[PDB]
Structure formats: structure tokens, C-alpha cells
Design an enzyme around this catalytic site. Sequence first.
Site, PDB file in Angstrom:
ATOM      1  N   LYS A  91      -1.650   5.628 -12.277  1.00 32.52           N
ATOM      2  CA  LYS A  91      -2.255   5.696 -13.841  1.00 32.52           C
ATOM      3  C   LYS A  91      -2.857   7.276 -13.694  1.00 32.52           C
ATOM      4  O   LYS A  91      -3.927   7.549 -13.035  1.00 32.52           O
ATOM      5  CB  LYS A  91      -2.986   4.675 -13.917  1.00 32.52           C
ATOM      6  CG  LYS A  91      -2.308   3.216 -13.929  1.00 32.52           C
ATOM      7  CD  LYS A  91      -3.220   2.075 -14.170  1.00 32.52           C
ATOM      8  CE  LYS A  91      -2.417   0.696 -14.407  1.00 32.52           C
ATOM      9  NZ  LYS A  91      -3.571  -0.216 -14.494  1.00 32.52           N
TER      10      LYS A  91
ATOM     11  N   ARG B  93      -0.674  -4.239  -5.836  1.00 31.05           N
ATOM     12  CA  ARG B  93      -0.692  -5.654  -5.379  1.00 31.05           C
ATOM     13  C   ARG B  93      -2.040  -5.641  -4.410  1.00 31.05           C
ATOM     14  O   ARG B  93      -2.027  -6.803  -3.661  1.00 31.05           O
ATOM     15  CB  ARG B  93       0.393  -5.978  -4.749  1.00 31.05           C
ATOM     16  CG  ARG B  93       1.538  -6.176  -6.001  1.00 31.05           C
ATOM     17  CD  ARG B  93       1.285  -7.480  -6.977  1.00 31.05           C
ATOM     18  NE  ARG B  93       1.519  -8.609  -5.931  1.00 31.05           N
ATOM     19  CZ  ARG B  93       2.742  -9.327  -5.678  1.00 31.05           C
ATOM     20  NH1 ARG B  93       3.858  -9.192  -6.606  1.00 31.05           N
ATOM     21  NH2 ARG B  93       2.906 -10.285  -4.888  1.00 31.05           N
ATOM     22  N   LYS B  94      -2.769  -4.676  -4.439  1.00 32.34           N
ATOM     23  CA  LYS B  94      -3.843  -4.621  -3.358  1.00 32.34           C
ATOM     24  C   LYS B  94      -5.095  -4.326  -4.045  1.00 32.34           C
ATOM     25  O   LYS B  94      -6.167  -3.631  -3.662  1.00 32.34           O
ATOM     26  CB  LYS B  94      -3.606  -3.999  -2.175  1.00 32.34           C
ATOM     27  CG  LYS B  94      -2.345  -4.263  -1.344  1.00 32.34           C
ATOM     28  CD  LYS B  94      -2.840  -5.425  -0.479  1.00 32.34           C
ATOM     29  CE  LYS B  94      -1.598  -6.106   0.124  1.00 32.34           C
ATOM     30  NZ  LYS B  94      -0.945  -7.086  -0.949  1.00 32.34           N
TER      31      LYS B  94
ATOM     32  N   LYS C  72       0.814  -1.277  -0.108  1.00 29.10           N
ATOM     33  CA  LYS C  72       0.080  -0.016  -0.053  1.00 29.10           C
ATOM     34  C   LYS C  72       0.862   1.290  -0.077  1.00 29.10           C
ATOM     35  O   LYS C  72       0.488   2.206  -0.504  1.00 29.10           O
ATOM     36  CB  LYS C  72      -0.794   0.122   1.174  1.00 29.10           C
ATOM     37  CG  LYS C  72      -2.323   0.418   0.799  1.00 29.10           C
ATOM     38  CD  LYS C  72      -2.967  -0.758  -0.132  1.00 29.10           C
ATOM     39  CE  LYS C  72      -4.338  -0.236  -0.776  1.00 29.10           C
ATOM     40  NZ  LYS C  72      -4.035   0.573  -2.047  1.00 29.10           N
TER      41      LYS C  72
HETATM   42 MG    MG Z   1       2.721  -8.221  -1.084  1.00 31.82          MG
END
Ligand code: MG
Lengths: 386, 386
Positions: free
Chosen positions: B268, B247-248, B18
Amino acid sequence: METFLFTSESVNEGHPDKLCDQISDAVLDACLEQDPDSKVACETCTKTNMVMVFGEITTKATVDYEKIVRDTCRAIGFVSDDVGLDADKCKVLVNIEQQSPDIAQGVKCPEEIGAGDQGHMFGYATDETPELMPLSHVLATKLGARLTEVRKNGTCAWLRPDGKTQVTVEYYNDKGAMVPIRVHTVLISTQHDETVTNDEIARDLKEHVIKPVIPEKYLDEKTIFHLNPSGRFVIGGPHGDAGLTGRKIIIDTYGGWGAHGGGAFSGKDPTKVDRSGAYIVRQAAKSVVANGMARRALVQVSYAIGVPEPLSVFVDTYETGLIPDKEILKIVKESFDFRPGMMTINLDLKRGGNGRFLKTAAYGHFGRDDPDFTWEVVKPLKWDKP
Amino acid sequence: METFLFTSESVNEGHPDKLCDQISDAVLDACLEQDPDSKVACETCTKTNMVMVFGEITTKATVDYEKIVRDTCRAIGFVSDDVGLDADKCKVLVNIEQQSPDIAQGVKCPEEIGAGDQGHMFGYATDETPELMPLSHVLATKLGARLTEVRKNGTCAWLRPDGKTQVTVEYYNDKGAMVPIRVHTVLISTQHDETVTNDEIARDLKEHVIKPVIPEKYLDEKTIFHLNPSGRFVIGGPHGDAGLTGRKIIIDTYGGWGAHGGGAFSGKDPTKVDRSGAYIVRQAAKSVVANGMARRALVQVSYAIGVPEPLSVFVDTYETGLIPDKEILKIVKESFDFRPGMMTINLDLKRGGNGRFLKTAAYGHFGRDDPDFTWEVVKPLKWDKP
Ligand SMILES: [Mg+2]
Ligand SMILES: [Cl-]
Ligand SMILES: [Cl-]
Ligand SMILES: [Cl-]
Ligand SMILES: [Cl-]
Ligand SMILES: [Cl-]
Ligand SMILES: [Cl-]
Ligand SMILES: [Cl-]
Ligand SMILES: [Cl-]
Ligand SMILES: [Cl-]
Ligand SMILES: [Cl-]
Ligand SMILES: [Cl-]
Ligand SMILES: [Cl-]
Ligand SMILES: [Cl-]
Ligand SMILES: [Cl-]
Ligand SMILES: [Cl-]
Ligand SMILES: [Cl-]
Ligand SMILES: [Mg+2]
Ligand SMILES: [Mg+2]
Ligand SMILES: [Mg+2]
């Protein structure tokens, strides 16, 4: 007949994010081949002329991380700056915290060991294809695999490694079951060399790639084709397009169908519940459908760090179950062992020397028949017939 | 009553993945504040004592990438090696391909410009909470936000930035609608300092974090609590735990509910359909439910690079629609403009100077009332009542 449109995509093995998944899992395979008890959290990123491997590894193995990077890139086809990365000449930054196992003095077991992390994972299956996967996903994925095949065997030697595919399927809903009717739209954007004409690309994509992959029963005069719609694609791979491990998790699983709990697979040893847990719930959903209990099934499991038993399990058959979902849940819980240490053993996931995880890291973790995909082997389930 | 268990998680703003989302979006915000037409594809990764920003930016803005990294880390609480990263002293690798806009000689518009990429995106809404989000996701997320709040305001000054939360909700299915009954299990694993005792952590988590967040109607004597179940958590953040942007993506959206098309949001610019498209379909699903057409709704859109009109749209109300889903689809298509150039304008996404995207990059992109979350504003929909 009332229909709806559902789209799934795929990316080719030369897409820079997928390149990173493959490098991460090639590193994992190399560790496990020598040391099945390796702890691996191998992340990869890439940009123009560079690959970096990072994360954490504890292993007894002796692994040439840089050589694995270069070998993986070279075999995909990244052999020059012109094709998007020179495997032999690019910068490779080796940024892994490498440890050997702890040395300790004293006189946990798979049955009792807690999960290594929290999280939740979903499995899905659907009777709409023989491998019990959604057709939109299967066709997008198979178009990508076919692009790689005809590039490597020289049939379409003008191809380069990067590219993307996308298929829109027109579906009918039969009592909760998904019934594919036709392919509505096919999109391919592929990297290519500077000599092939736009007309040759379009003809070869139709004849060498689309026609062999998509069953003719699903194609008709109305099917829409978009073939390199944005024009030329000579530049590809990492060149001007950064990649990272774990950025293709929907392509890796079910293409928008089912659900996802968020955890990436590649670069993670199979003690990690993001990987083993997701593989077991694929096996469970596939087994529910294959044993005839349902036409479609979604299974969730969840974990807490340090706790061996899952915090929750559900089953949803989308109203297609022939017995109640609460009874299917009971059967799944009785038949599957969701304990982290046991999942890894029961799916034989530490077994080294077969390149198992690199095979998973392009063209999907699910729906493949290879014997190393142990989670695709249906478990026989006993069920009290309606 | 027949119930089932559904789990969602969250991670705190100090979790290393995060952290990377927040850095990526702080860079984006800085670009847009000076140049609303910035093209931004900013990726971040981190490991012990290091952050690297990479990817591609075309901008007229003058942005101090390293300073944004350090400021973002410092404000989260990464002020020393002991708490998991020293914002002032750590290595910051600036690895962005920075360009100014093209200089050209000659005498595309939002209505006609093609998508910048292919892909598909889903939006979801459910009447089970006032913000039209799934309760399991809302509660996991709010526990995380609350951990940050009580750490920063000194109520629980023993806390450190990293941590994870997870909530299992027991649900009833009412004619396709999801009706939360109770909270089954609450998990918190939080980073903390080396002085606080396990007893103080458990008491403060119950009284300062869980009690204020979870409505008392959902808690009972049977609710299971797992509070730092794996023991001590003094080490956190990037220290020994690599992070990456994107990745979350399930925590960023719907927590396992609805669906995901795969594309990450952070880093982005809002010309990118992975971001604008996902935001518009949240607005569309939320509008279907809020206008009374359904209790629950899933909306998919898909795109092809170089093509302005979407390749497909569907709507699914899980049998909760008061008019047929094909009629809701027609209304959504007539009422929403899915063209890439128009989505960005209609949601006012280029507007600079409000830190909009950094706000999205922790504690979820959806279900928040802040006026900069323009995709949470319901559009009035006209519908031919049943
Ligand atoms: Mg990770
Ligand atoms: Cl090098
Ligand atoms: Cl060890
Ligand atoms: Cl343990
Ligand atoms: Cl784990
Ligand atoms: Cl050439
Ligand atoms: Cl090009
Ligand atoms: Cl359960
Ligand atoms: Cl099993
Ligand atoms: Cl530095
Ligand atoms: Cl430009
Ligand atoms: Cl265009
Ligand atoms: Cl785009
Ligand atoms: Cl301390
Ligand atoms: Cl610790
Ligand atoms: Cl459509
Ligand atoms: Cl609109
Ligand atoms: Mg060497
Ligand atoms: Mg990417
Ligand atoms: Mg400076």
C-alpha cells in the site's frame, strides 16, 4: 461523566476480501460434508473478472471447486459484470494441490496429538451486550447484515453487494467495565445501482437500515451520519479491487477490542489451532463473564507445533473480576481442554452438512446464537464465591 | 510476586506469507523511487513454483514487476526447488491492472483531501524495552532476524530461509505498567538442509541464536526450550504452503499487545490511511510514553472515505498516565496532524530510493531505529506537569 470514543467497522458480504473468506469456507464445508477428516488450507484471491482458489487439500471428498466458487459468488449477488463480477462467466482458476489421504502399511489419538502449528489466540467477552460482545463491533456488523437483508428481500433493491459500515460509540469506564452511553458517529458506504438518487439512498439508509438496527436509546440529535460520503459507488466487488482470504481478521473477531494473535480463520479445517484455539478461548472468555466471575475478560492460549499442551494461558479481567485473575486462570485451565485434538471434538467442529463455516465467513465468527456456533455455548464454571 | 504469561511469535523472511509482504513492498518501493505520487495496491500470492502479483497500480514509473519478484525471492535465499522456490525458474504471473495517471483538461491539496477509505488504526508503546515495544514481541522478532543473519553470513550455513519463533514472557503488573521478569518458553522451528543433525541444530540454535539475542538476566534453569519440536524441516517457503500479502499483521505490529484495526500494510502506498494512520498513531503512543506522560499508551484513530478529519481519536494509558487520559488526548490532538494528506508529508513517506518499505516488510514495522522509520522519531510534547 468522563467518556471516550471507540470505533469498529464491518464490510459487507460483497466486499472482495470477504468474498474470498466465504469461498474458502464454502470449499471447507463441502469437503467436511463428505469427509470430516479433510485437511484443508484453502486460500482464495480475486480481481477483475477472476477468482483463484489455491492452497492444499487432503480429502476423500469429491468437491467441484469451480462450481463452489461460482455458486458462492452468485448467491452473494455477483450475477453480471455491471455489479462487479459475473459468477457464470468470470475466469475461475483452480490452483489447489489436491491429495487423497496417505496409503500406508501398518497394524495419533486426539488426547496426544500435537498442535499442527505454533501461534497464539485470544478470546474476549464483555457484558455490555446480551451476546457478550463489544457494542461498536455489534452495531457495525449488524448494519452490514441489514444492508444484505434489505437488498436480498427487495426492500432496497437498488443496493448492490459491496459496502462498508463503521460505528463510533461513546463509552464510560465503570471500574474496568465498558458502559456504552451513545452512538457518536455512523458511517455507511454502500454499492448501489445507476438509477437511485443520492437523496433516496440517504433516506432509505436512515429509515430501512440505521433505525431498525441501532437501539433508539443510543441515537440523539448530535449523532453524526456519513452516508455514502465519497459520492457514487456503482462499481464494486472484485472489479478494480483485489481481494484475498484472511484480510478481515479484526471484523471476524472483536472489532479492535480484546486482542488478536494474527491467524485468519477461513479456509482452515478445524484441526488447525488458529481456528479451534480461537473458538475455545472465545468460549472461555464468554463463560468467565456469563458465570458472573467478571464483567469483561481476555484469554490467551499459545501452542508449539508437535506439542499437545498449550505453552501458555492467561486471563485478564480488566480489574472487573470478582475473584482474583490467578483463581479464574486455574478454573479455566481445569474446565477447558486446550489440547488440539480435544478442542475439535468438544466443539463438534468436524460435523458436516450444515454450512457451518460459510455462516462464520461473513458478519463475524462471534456473538451469534446459531446452534452451529458451539463456541458461543457457555460452559458452567464452579467458582469459590468471594 | 504475582505473575502472568504472555506469548508473541514471529516468522522468518522465508515464510511464504512474509515473502508476499516483501514482494508487495519491493514493488511499492520501485514505483515510489521513480514516481513519489504512485497509487499502489499491490497484492502477492504464492504456492509451489509460482508467485502472482496482482492488484492495481497507477504510476508514471517503469517497473519490471517480474524482475522485482525474482530479485526479492533470490535475495531471501530462494535459489532452487530444493530450498522451496527457484527464483530464476519459477512461474511469475504478472496480474496487475497497470494505469498511467489520468489525463485531464482544466486550469486535492494535502490539507483538505479526504481519506481514501474508512477504517481504524491503533498505536501502542510500553516502557518495558528501550525501543518502547513489548518484550515478548521484541524477542520473538529478534530471534527471527538473528536466524536470517547467521544463515546469510555463513555462521549457520545449514539454515534455510523459512522458519518461525515464539517467546513466552513472565510479566508482573506494576500499577498498569508491564514489567518483564523472565523468559518462560522459547520456541524455534527453522528450515534447514538435509545434512545437519538434530543435535547440531539444537546446539547451534542455543549458542548462535538464543544466547546472543535474549538478555541473560531473563534466562534461567527453568526456561523451557522447544527446538524444531516437530522434527525435520527441510521443505519450506511456498513449496506445499501457500502465502498471501497481509497475513502477518500482528507480527507486523505489536505481537498481541495493544490492538489492531485490521488493515495490512504491505503493498500500500503511503497515501493509504491503513499505513500512514497506523504509523502516526505509533508515533503518538511512543511520544506519550517517551515524553514521560505515561509508562504505556494505546491510541486509536478512525476515518471515513472522503473526509479529511478523523471520525474519532482515543488515548488509554492503562492507568499509568501521570495526567488524565482526557488531557493526554487533548495534547495528542493538538500536536499531531491526523489529516491523510498531512500524515504522508509529515512522516516523509513518499521519499524514494532508500528501500524503505521493503525494510518494514520483515521483522516488524515498529521498534526499529533506522532513520527511514520516521514514525519511530519521538515528537516533543508540552504537558502541564501534575
Ligand atoms: Mg499462512
Ligand atoms: Cl474459467
Ligand atoms: Cl494423509
Ligand atoms: Cl503428534
Ligand atoms: Cl494447526
Ligand atoms: Cl442500474
Ligand atoms: Cl463507482
Ligand atoms: Cl499457563
Ligand atoms: Cl472444553
Ligand atoms: Cl513465468
Ligand atoms: Cl490518476
Ligand atoms: Cl477529497
Ligand atoms: Cl486510504
Ligand atoms: Cl542438503
Ligand atoms: Cl520437511
Ligand atoms: Cl475524537
Ligand atoms: Cl504530525
Ligand atoms: Mg465442474
Ligand atoms: Mg483489501
Ligand atoms: Mg523483464
